[PDB]
Amino acid sequence: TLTEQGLGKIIGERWARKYLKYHI
Amino acid sequence: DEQEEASTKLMQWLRGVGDAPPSAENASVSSANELIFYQVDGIDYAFYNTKEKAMLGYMRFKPYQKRSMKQAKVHPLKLLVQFGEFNVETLAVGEEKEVHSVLRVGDMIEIDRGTRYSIQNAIDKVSVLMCIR
Amino acid sequence: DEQEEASTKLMQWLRGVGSVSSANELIFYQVDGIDYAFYNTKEKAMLGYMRFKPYQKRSMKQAKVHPLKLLVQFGEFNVETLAVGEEKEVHSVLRVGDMIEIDRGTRYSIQNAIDKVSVLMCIRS
Amino acid sequence: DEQEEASTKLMQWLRGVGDAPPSASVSSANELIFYQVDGIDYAFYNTKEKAMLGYMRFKPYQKRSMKQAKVHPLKLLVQFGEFNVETLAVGEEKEVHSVLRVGDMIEIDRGTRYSIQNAIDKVSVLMCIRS
Amino acid sequence: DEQEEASTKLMQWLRGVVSSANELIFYQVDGIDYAFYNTKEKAMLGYMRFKPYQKRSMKQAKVHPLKLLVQFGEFNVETLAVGEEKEVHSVLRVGDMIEIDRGTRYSIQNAIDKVSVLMCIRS
């Protein structure tokens, strides 16, 4: 259902939606 | 009884018989609700959404499925069996003879820097592995 | 049945209910009233289990030389964290499968939140 | 023409126009995804230390009220538009007012409290450089 | 539109065609044009202006890590990490960034037949 580059982006988006507010 | 039912519904979810992960504030906290399974290169992967990415997750293997040898690149690895049975082959940066290990539930193997390893589901059922980087 | 029935007996063992480091080599020792079982790793005490009695509490401690992850193997836990510089304690409730990351310098305490034995896996990075 | 066209479509993308992005240690511009956090759009490059270099996209006259440079000193450089920045020192009570146009830069030391407001009725874009 | 043309007049200035852009003086060192903002620590944020296919000699990030962001054009960057034997090659277009860790040796070349401008960020 996904490629390895695709998992990297999906994990990257999910990481940002949770942790970006603590780096601003 | 309540904790037993929650424990079984997590296991069944990890084993792939579930419609939704165990549903759950604090960013330090990665709840079981963050275990979404993605199929990559034919293997199911679920990682907790954590501060450093992909440091703790689960590998769901289909019956007798094997993952070809790979190398521990930038981080050391620990493989702990969540459910089922696995055959692990380990090859260090030297020597030609590979080490063969059988891991059942609860067993753990440490994979050091640079070591090449392969994983095979040893049985005709779904087997689940926890990967700790 | 054999594998499901084998996994259940490991949980019961961890719950107190009756380079490969296997589960049979997990001997539990009690320190300050809490049961600990650690896997044999190159670095000592990097991966183990903490078994808590009903509503048992673990004294506040600091992740000094090491970052920590707490993953609930069974039951429910109350974890309190004190971050670097922060005056307010953060409280989290963790059920089975839930995990918390405790950074370097953070002071943390753990209490079993329920009236049953609860087991957490401590993962050192 | 090619270089001027690539530069123009990067700017429009950062401004929120276009819908199309500019197609290991390299973090390229087409990998810049904007996330809305507390109502302001942020896009950061993938760096070893997370969120050390990024862009802040402001809506017309949108302001972010004062926050403190807690653990990292920062530099604000205007990528596009106009900004009003207010700075407050450690023990100082009087805030200093700055107007920054494209290319202008302000250095915010650790502990300084600062605020940013988009000065115009258009999207303005800021580059945040933390050390 | 007034804001678009103001940004274009900054770019053309950089292409050779509070620290404000007007306080940016370009000084040539070893054949390369440098303009730095006035910061507390000197020369930590600036621009490198390259002539067509101009080359920058290999240097080492000694006491600092480095970040390279392309303001205009295209660049060829070669990096040699410490201990590593093989050079890594990357091409950067406008908006692309590469991080240069402490101790790694790096070289930069303008990859095209136009003036290219790079922003150098020491953090």
Residue numbers in the entry:
A (entry chain E): 890 to 913
B (entry chain A): 1274 to 1297, 1302 to 1410
C (entry chain B): 1274 to 1291, 1305 to 1411
D (entry chain C): 1274 to 1296, 1304 to 1411
E (entry chain D): 1274 to 1290, 1306 to 1411
Wording from the paper:
Centromeres are microtubule attachment sites on chromosomes defined by the enrichment of histone variant CENP‐A‐containing nucleosomes. To preserve centromere identity, CENP‐A must be escorted to centromeres by a CENP‐A‐specific chaperone for deposition. In this study, we present the structural basis for the recognition of CENP‐A/H4 and CENP‐C by CAL1.
The calculated electrostatic surface properties show that CAL1 binding involves a surface suitable for both electrostatic and hydrophobic interactions. CAL1 residues 890–893, which form a β‐strand, interact with β1 of CENP‐C cupin domain running parallel to it and as a consequence extend the β sheet involved in cupin dimerisation. The CAL1 α helix consisting of residues 894–913 makes several hydrophobic (involving L896, I900, W904 and Y908) and electrostatic (R903 and K906) interactions with a complementary hydrophobic (involving residues Y1315, V1317, Y1322 and F1323) and acidic (S1295, E1311 and N1326) region of the cradle‐shaped CENP‐C surface. To evaluate the requirement of these interactions to stabilise CAL1–CENP‐C binding, we mutated conserved CENP‐C F1324 to Arg and CAL1 I900 to Arg and K907 and Y908 to Ala and tested the ability of these mutants to bind wild‐type CAL1 and CENP‐C, respectively, in separate SEC experiments. In the crystal structure presented here, the CAL1 binding site on CENP‐C is in close proximity to the cupin dimerisation interface: the loop L1 and β‐strands β1, β2 and β3 are all directly involved in stabilising the cupin dimer. Although CAL1 binding by CENP‐C involves just a cupin monomer, only one of the two cupin monomers was observed to interact with CAL1, while the equivalent CAL1 binding site of the dimeric counterpart was empty in the crystal structure. We speculate that the other binding site might be sterically hindered by the remaining residues of CAL1 not seen in the crystal structure, thus not allowing a second monomer of CAL1 to bind.
